[PDB]
Amino acid sequence: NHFIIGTDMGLISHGTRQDLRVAPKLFKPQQHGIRPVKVNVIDFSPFG
Amino acid sequence: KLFIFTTTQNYFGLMSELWDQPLLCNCLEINNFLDDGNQMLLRVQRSDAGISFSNTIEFGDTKDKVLVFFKLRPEVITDENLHDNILVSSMLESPISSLYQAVRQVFAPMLLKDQEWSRNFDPKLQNLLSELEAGLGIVLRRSKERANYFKELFETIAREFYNLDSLSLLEVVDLVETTQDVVDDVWRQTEHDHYPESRMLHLLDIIGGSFGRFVQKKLGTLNLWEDPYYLVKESLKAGISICEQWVIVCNHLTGQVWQRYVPHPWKNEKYFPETLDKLGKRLEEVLAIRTIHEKFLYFLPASEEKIICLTRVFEPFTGLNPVQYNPYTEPL
Amino acid sequence: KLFIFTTTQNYFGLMSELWDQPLLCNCLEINNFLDDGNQMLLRVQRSDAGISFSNTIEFGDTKDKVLVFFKLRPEVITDENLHDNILVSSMLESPISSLYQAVRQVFAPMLLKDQEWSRNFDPKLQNLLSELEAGLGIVLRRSKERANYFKELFETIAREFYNLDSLSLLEVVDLVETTQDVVDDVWRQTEHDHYPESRMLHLLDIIGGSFGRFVQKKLGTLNLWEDPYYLVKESLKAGISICEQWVIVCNHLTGQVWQRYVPHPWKNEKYFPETLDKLGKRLEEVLAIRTIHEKFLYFLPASEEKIICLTRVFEPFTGLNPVQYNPYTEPL
Hints:
The structure is cut from a larger assembly and holds one copy of chain A (48 residues) and two copies of chain B (332 residues). Chain A has strands spanning 2-6, 12-16, 26-27. Chain A is mostly beta strands and 48 residues long. A three-stranded antiparallel β-sheet of chain A has the order 1-2-3, with no helix packed on it. The two termini of chain A are 16 Å apart. In chain A, 0% of the residues are buried. In chain B, helix 7 (197-220) runs antiparallel to helix 8 (229-260). Chain B is extended. Chain B has a four-stranded antiparallel β-sheet with strand order 2-1-3-4. In chain B, 56% of the residues lie in helices and 8% in strands. Chain B is an alpha+beta fold and 332 residues long. Classes of the chains: A mainly beta (48), B alpha+beta (332). At the B-C interface, helix 1, helix 2, strand 3, strand 4 and helix 3 of B face helix 1, strand 3, strand 4, helix 3 and helix 4 of C.
C-alpha cells in the first residue's frame, strides 16, 4: 500500500493508498535549490 | 529561589528570610517552575520540619493549609526580581470550607466592587457566586417503636441495594424496576401517615445517583474502543435500558404513589434530577456511531480508504467524551 | 501588626522583616482590618516610595501588582500566631482577567479532583463553576464574508494549533510548512478588500510564542544524553530542523506577503522573537558535545586511557545540561 513517486524536478514523494495522511513527506538529499537531476530509476532493497 | 522560599516561610513558618541553603530535593521542582515555559503553577506545603514543592496539585489532605504560586509570563525573567512576575494565593485543603471562604471573602466582594463599567456578564457572575457560597455555607455549618421499625426496614433495603457493583448490567436492567416498586411501597401509610420528607426523597436520590455511578463504572469496563464490539453492544444496550427505565418509572409512578399510598405534600410532580438521562444519551450516541461503522464495514470494499483512515481520525474525537462521562464540559 | 507589614515587604519591597515602627498614617486602616469584625479585606499597593493600605479595591492602574489581605475569623486573635488566621491573594490590575485565571486554575480542578464519588449536591457546584469560569472567559476574550474567510483559514490549522500535544516531531515539520501556506492565503484581499494588519501580526506573535514553547516542550522530554547516540542525534536533529525551518520561513515569507498580498507600507521586516533559533543553537551544542565524545569512542584505541578519565569527569558536567534552556541561566 505504500509507494513513492519520482519527478524530473529532482524530488521523490511518499504516499500510500488507504490512509493518505500517514507521512506525506518528500525525499531530498542534503542539498539546496532544486538540482533537477531527473531521477530515472527507482528500486527497493529486498530485505527487512 | 528567593521569592519562592521567602513566601513559604512568611506563610507557613517563621516570618523571616530563609538561609541561602538551597540543598533540598524540592529545588528541582522550583527550577522547573521558573524555567519551564509550560509550568504556570507550583504548589508548596509545609512538611514535618520540612518544605515540599511540587508542580502537581493534590487534594488528599483533610484540612491543611497550602499555598500555590502562579506565573504571569511564559518564562521567568531571572534578572528581574522574582516577585515582579509571580502571583501568590493561599488556600485551605477543605472541599467545603476552602471554597466557602475563598469565594465569600475574596471573589464575591471583589466582583461586587472591582467591576469595569464597560464589561458585561458581571451581574450574572455575581449571581453565580452568591448562589455558590450560599450552598457551601449550609453544608459547612453541618414513640421509638415506629422509629426503630423505620430504621430497620429501610436500613435492610439500603444494605441489600448497596451491593450493586456486584451485579452485571444485564441484571440491573431488572433491578431498577424491582427497587422502584419496593421503595415506593414501604413509604406507604404503614405505621405513620408519612415519614419525614428528609429520607422520603434522600433515599430515592441516593438510589438514582447510585445507578448512575454504577453504569458509569460498568460501561468503562467494556473498553468501548476495542475489537470485541459484539459483547459491548449487548452490555451497552443494558446500560441504556438501566438509565432510561429508572427515569421513566420515577416520573410516572411518583405521580400516583404520593396520591394513593403516602399522603406526601408533593402531588403530580417529580423529584429526580434525571442525570441518567444524559448518560443514556451518551451511550446511545456511541452505539449509533459504532453501529454505523459496522454497517460501513460490510461495505468495506466500497469505502475502504474512508473507513480505515477515519477510524483513527475519529479516535481523538471520541477522546473528548471518555468513559465515566459527566457533562460538565459538554460543549467540548 | 507583624504579618501585614512583613508580607507587604516580602512581596513588594525588601525580602525582610520591617522594624517594629508602626508610625505610618496607613496604620489606621491596618488596625481596622485587624480589629474591625466587618473589614474582612485590606488591599495594599506600593506607590512611588510609598505604601497604601485600604479596603477599597481599584483598577485605575494598568499592569501593576497588588495584594489583598483576607481574614478567616471576624477579628484577629492576637494570642494566636498572626500568620495562621490570615490569607493573601495577589492580582494584576484587571477586574476580569484576575477572576478568570483565579477561578479556572483554583476552583475548577479543586472540586473535580477533591470529590467523593458518592457525595451529592456537587453536580450543582460543578455546573456553577462551569458557568462561572465560562462567563469570565467569554468576557476576557471580547461584509461578514471577510471575517468568515479569515476564520475558515484559521481553523484549517487551528485544530492542531490548540491540540499540538498529540503530534510528533515529524508532523511538526510538516505543520511548519503547512501553516505558512495557509496563513499566507489570509493576506489575500480578493474576497473582501479589508485586511486586518493588526490581527495578523498579533496572531503570528501568539502562534510563534506558543509553537516555540511546544517545540522545546517535546525536545525537553527526549533526555538527549543517553547511550543510544543513534536515537539521540536523530531526534535531536529533528528539533533543529524544526527550529531552523520555522524561523527562516516565517521571517522571509512574512516580509514578502506584507508587500505582495497586501500592498502595505511594511516589507522585509522581522516579526518574530526567534525563540526557536536560540533553541536550535542549544541543540547544536548538545549534539557537538555528545558527538565529539562518540568520536573519541570510535577512535578509542588512540587515547583509551584518556577517555576513561574523561568519561568520569564528563558525567558530572553532563549533569549540568538541563532542559528548557532559559537564556538568562544558560551560563551554567
